[PDB]
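Researcher: Next entry in the queue.
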Amino acid sequence: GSNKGAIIGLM
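Model: Structure for this entry, 11 residues:
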């Protein structure tokens, strides 16, 4: 649930 928001993404 987050393809445009992206929950993670190299934190």
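Model: The two ends are 17 Å apart (CA to CA).
Researcher: Noted, moving on.
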